[PDB]
Design a protein around this ligand. Structure first.
Ligand code: HEM
Length: 243
């Protein structure tokens, strides 16, 4: 395991034990995404939360042999199975802790890429034949358990891009392709989804949508850039993926 529904996340926690800080990270996350004024910009995530469609896990950096990447690989395999049954719009939120006071965005980003690397070692499935393995390829995406994931990193060090601050921990948000059924970027519903989320971003964030966010007319190349947005509108070089 370590794959939890909301009800299964423990009620309170003892900071010194493995995952003893998770109750607090979970409360702050749920407070952020359910906040009513201004609303959390992604109404899909809010609704996911309200319907009980979000799952959770964690990594405890102090207990790597038992509550680390290997256990997360097992939890992701279980999540992948859950995500292809029942409702289409599910998300997995993974808290990485304990929180490190003072951490900068660069540091959180470094930790994010290290974890993705480490998870690779615990994959039981080969890299998908239809996604290139070179991360400098325009079509590269992170893959695990035989398919590509949609993934991004949230951090308290986001000051203007407040939408990506989900509480005190480095937080990973994972989804399978299924969540986008009917809302592909090129469709009328997909465009409506973009308009609606971006209106929410305008009122919640102090900086506008990042330039690497697609208009949805073409497949977006160098998706890696979207996993770890900067807090400004700088655009990284397509070929500088850190994995
Ligand atoms: C807890 C779950 C979720 C969170 C925390 C979340 C968070 C976000 C954030 C922060 C953005 C703004 C763009 C960015 O920073 O990358 C975003 C945009 C978006 N999200 Fe979510 N989201 C969640 C679940 C979902 C689900 C389940 C779907 C679809 C069913 C979805 C669809 C979208 C779409 C379509 C956009 C807009 C992309 C654009 O304007 O180009 N999200 N989400």
């Amino acid at each position: 395991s370590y794959l939890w529904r909301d009800s299964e996340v423990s009620r309170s926690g003892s900071g010194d034990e493995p995952f003893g800080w998770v109750p607090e990270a979970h409360s702050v996350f749920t407070e952020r995404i359910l906040a009513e004024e201004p609303p959390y910009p992604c109404y899909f995530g809010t609704q996911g939360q309200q319907r009980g469609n979000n799952s959770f896990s964690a990594v405890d950096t102090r207990y790597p042999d038992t509550h680390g990447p290997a256990a997360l690989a097992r939890s992701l395999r279980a999540y992948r199975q859950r995500a292809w049954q029942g409702p289409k719009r599910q998300t997995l939120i993974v808290f990485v802790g304990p929180a490190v006071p003072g951490a900068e965005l660069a540091d959180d980003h470094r930790r994010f890429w290290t974890l993705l690397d480490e998870l690779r070692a615990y994959d039981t499935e080969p890299w998908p034949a239809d996604v290139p393995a070179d991360p400098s390829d325009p079509r590269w995406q992170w893959c695990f358990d035989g398919e590509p994931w949609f993934i991004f990193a949230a951090s308290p060090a986001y000051k203007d891009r407040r939408s990506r601050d989900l509480g005190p921990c480095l937080t990973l948000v994972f989804q399978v392709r299924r969540v986008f059924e009917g809302i592909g970027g090129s469709t009328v519903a997909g465009k409506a989804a973009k308009r609606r989320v971006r209106e929410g971003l305008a009122r919640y964030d102090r900086i506008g949508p990042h330039p690497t966010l697609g208009d949805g007319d073409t497949s977006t190349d160098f998706k890696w850039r979207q996993y770890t947005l900067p807090d400004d509108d700088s655009v990284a070089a397509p070929d500088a993926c850190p994995v």
